[PDB]
Design a binder for this molecule. Structure first.
Ligand SMILES: Nc1ncnc2c1ncn2[C@@H]1O[C@H](COP(=O)(O)O)[C@@H](OP(=O)(O)O)[C@H]1O
Ligand SMILES: Nc1ncnc2c1ncn2[C@@H]1O[C@H](COP(=O)(O)O)[C@@H](OP(=O)(O)O)[C@H]1O
Ligand SMILES: [Mg+2]
Ligand SMILES: [Mg+2]
Ligand SMILES: [Mg+2]
Ligand SMILES: [Mg+2]
Lengths: 221, 221
């Protein structure tokens, strides 16, 4: 699994690389995609099939996963998690809220960013630091995935906007040259609605099978 | 009502000015606010009481209003609408999809914008044009409201991001000095999922009772 390369043992994950046949929303989810085009319906249903497989590994039965503030997923009591879908990937990660405070994941095609996007998503200091990272890796795309995972882990604990310029992400590469760690240093007020302040979020990144994947798992102390 | 000052006929509106006692979510809505702090629970529940009053006026029984892509409200079959909540205001507008293509509304306290917001939401040309507008009005705040109503009317028809810089808003002021019209000229690809391109959205604005309110109601062709 691509997500096993960026996750700890305390969470369950499930992923697919396509839209498997015969998948349906649960009845409670139907209104969220009643008006959605085929591509949106597919990713929504497929990623929630993945979520319910991962929930099953936690000993949680099939439940609907609705959407709340700014699109955040709505987990059953005692569960936290994150969802992501891009071209060739749907993935879900869940953990017990007794062991895990927040999860944020992202997956993107491992390709150069469209012209203009890098400058829009970076601090000057990030552009400099990227230029000195090693490997034939699309560091622009990897940075984008890390910013996205950071927002997904941050938002359920704060319900505040985190802009691209509001986190400074630094990367470390493990011996493989294709995976490692990142740290997101939060540059804005770090007060959380629950648990300790979010001054910094540590995560993992991996580039494998034409995808960049990032995950942050914030643990309950 | 404050919303009646910015609306045509064939839409229903409802509003209140606080969070009254004696309100509950519908049971299908409970998951959306199950982890929410009181201020968020209260605004969510009150604005949906408003939405159900406006639906009742239109002839639609009380239904849950869930959230979909990027937080967009999920309306019942044959209905479009918009919701807003700020300090001292909750309001809802709904129409039949047979009369109305889309609806966007916004309400803000009529106060100067907080630091840095005006520059984040404007083109250079807009900052120039706003300096030219007449009256002791917070034109920075009214522009923010018109950009918010624009995005809410646009998003359901496109499912594409509209940045604050992707819409050029121009205002008219009526002889009252506290109401008028605006036009939002769209600067990105205007193609809709159905019907004619969204090249420009026309709306109304009003300042009354310490609030700025904006509404766009788009015609069903
Ligand atoms: N504000 C937010 N906080 C955390 N997760 C969010 C979020 N808004 C959206 N998400 C999650 O991000 C998912 C999409 O991830 P990505 O954009 O990387 O493919 C959404 O999938 P769904 O819309 O299917 O629920 C949703 O579950
Ligand atoms: N992408 C989107 N498109 C249209 N309406 C949206 C939207 N995201 C959020 N909204 C609506 O805007 C409301 C909030 O408006 P405002 O920010 O002006 O107070 C939300 O209220 P709820 O979160 O209570 O559903 C939701 O109904
Ligand atoms: Mg996706
Ligand atoms: Mg993503
Ligand atoms: Mg609000
Ligand atoms: Mg608003």
């Amino acid at each position: 699994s691509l997500l096993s390369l960026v996750l700890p043992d305390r969470v369950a994950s499930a992923e697919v690389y396509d839209d498997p046949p015969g998948l349906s929303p649960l009845p409670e989810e139907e209104p969220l995609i009643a008006r959605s085009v085929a591509k949106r319906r597919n990713e929504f249903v497929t990623v929630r099939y993945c979520a319910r497989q991962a929930l099953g590994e936690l000993g949680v039965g099939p439940v609907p996963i609705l959407k709340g503030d700014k699109g955040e997923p709505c987990w059953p009591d005692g569960v936290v998690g994150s969802l992501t879908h891009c071209q060739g990937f749907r993935g879900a990660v869940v953990g017990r809220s007794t062991d895990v405070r927040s999860v944020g994941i992202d997956a993107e095609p491992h390709d150069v960013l469209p012209n203009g996007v890098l400058d829009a998503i970076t601090l000057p200091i990030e552009r400099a630091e990227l230029r000195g990272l090693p490997g034939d890796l699309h560091w622009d795309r990897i940075l984008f995935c890390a910013k996205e995972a950071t927002y997904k882990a941050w938002y359920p604990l704060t319900h505040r906007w985190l802009g691209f310029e509001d986190a400074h992400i630094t990367f470390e590469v493990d011996g493989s040259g294709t995976a490692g760690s990142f740290r997101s240093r939060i540059l804005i007020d770090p007060v959380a609605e629950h648990g300790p302040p979010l001054t910094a979020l540590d995560g993992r990144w991996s580039v494998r099978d034409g995808l960049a994947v990032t995950a942050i798992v914030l643990l309950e102390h």
